[PDB]
Amino acid sequence: LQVSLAQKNRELDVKNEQANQKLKQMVQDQQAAEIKQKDARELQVQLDVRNKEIAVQKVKAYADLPLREEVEQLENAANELKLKQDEIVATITALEKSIATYKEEYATLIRETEQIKTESSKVKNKVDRSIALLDNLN
């Protein structure tokens, strides 16, 4: 029973490194996405200026009613954007999910590690407990 438990302790080391490895991939696979997020978040913010800007002038000039044509221009500009926003808000969701699953996955790979660590433990005790038995029997 000493041989087998030293064996299974091996089946664990590997089981654990195959996961302890893949888990490293997750960090350099989720930190990646997060970057886009934080990055592309700067854009949603940045371009937020424009809509809020182009917004007020619309209000003003529309009441103040080249103005006409100039206003035709604000309406288009705010359109170029309105579109380019739905553009990044879709880009944000892209990661939002992509990244939120890496978590649900990390957490899962964590459970696998936790279960492994414990097994290894419950085996060490049994092995330690066999070294005592062998010795008293000998």
Curated annotation (Swiss-Prot):
<feature type="coiled-coil region">
    <location>
        <begin position="1"/>
        <end position="48"/>
    </location>
</feature>
<protein>
    <recommendedName>
        <fullName>Dynein heavy chain, cytoplasmic</fullName>
    </recommendedName>
</protein>
<feature type="coiled-coil region">
    <location>
        <begin position="66"/>
        <end position="138"/>
    </location>
</feature>
<comment type="function">
    <text>Cytoplasmic dynein acts as a motor for the intracellular retrograde motility of vesicles and organelles along microtubules. Dynein has ATPase activity; the force-producing power stroke is thought to occur on release of ADP.</text>
</comment>
<comment type="similarity">
    <text>Belongs to the dynein heavy chain family.</text>
</comment>
<comment type="subunit">
    <text>Consists of at least two heavy chains and a number of intermediate and light chains.</text>
</comment>
